[PDB]
Ligand binder design. Structure first.
Ligand SMILES: CC(=O)N[C@@H](CC1CCCCC1)[C@@H](O)C[C@H](C(=O)N[C@@H](CCC(N)=O)C(=O)N[C@@H](CCCNC(=N)N)C(N)=O)C(C)C
Lengths: 99, 99
């Protein structure tokens, strides 16, 4: 789908059996989700953004379905204010920026 | 151009007689630039992101040349780590998301 930027580019994701919504973000290297029920192991990590740094849990090899498209990758779970799909998964679904 | 997401989508901008580089950010509603020499009147504002919030000065009606394209709009100047072009100018240059 061709997405215009007049509204926030929100998409529905299915992750770990749960449906959620997330923002398609080109300015984020990573995928960061609001706290949730995930399984398996995890590593602690820190990322930085606009108002500073947050502490997250890094989970590898997580399957995520984005707009009906499967992708497998690292997902960071922590105190983000909004679920963000970043560059690590955006490349997987062949997502491009066109002007 | 058609921009792939394997690397950060960076572009060259021209603002205030100054050459800079900025990120195209679909997850930012606004445009936020590092601290600079900007002529005029401003208003304080608060914006927030991943790690928290920040204090910024809001400049309106600023001309920006974005990768050759001219746009006029609200520009926020403050303590960002990286220069960001968000959705308010992105729509002005016809930029879309595509998968
Ligand atoms: C990984 C990350 O951190 N990468 C940043 C971009 C940048 C941060 C610094 C390091 C380089 C990369 C963003 O790509 C993330 C994006 C974000 O930080 N976006 C802001 C900032 C700019 C702006 N001011 O537009 C945003 O849109 N802020 C709105 C609030 C929207 C939240 N929604 C609710 N109302 N609940 C605001 N008015 O402050 C997400 C979390 C939404």
């Amino acid at each position: 789908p061709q997405i215009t930027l007049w509204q926030r580019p929100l998409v529905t994701i299915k992750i770990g059996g749960q449906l959620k919504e997330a923002l398609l973000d080109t300015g984020s290297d990573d995928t960061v989700l609001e706290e949730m029920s995930l399984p398996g192991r995890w590593k602690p990590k820190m990322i930085g953004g606009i108002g500073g740094f947050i502490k997250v849990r890094q989970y590898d090899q997580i399957l995520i379905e984005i707009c009906g498209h499967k992708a497998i990758g690292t997902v960071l779970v922590g105190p983000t204010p909004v679920n963000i799909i970043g560059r690590n998964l955006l490349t997987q679904i062949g997502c491009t920026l066109n002007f």
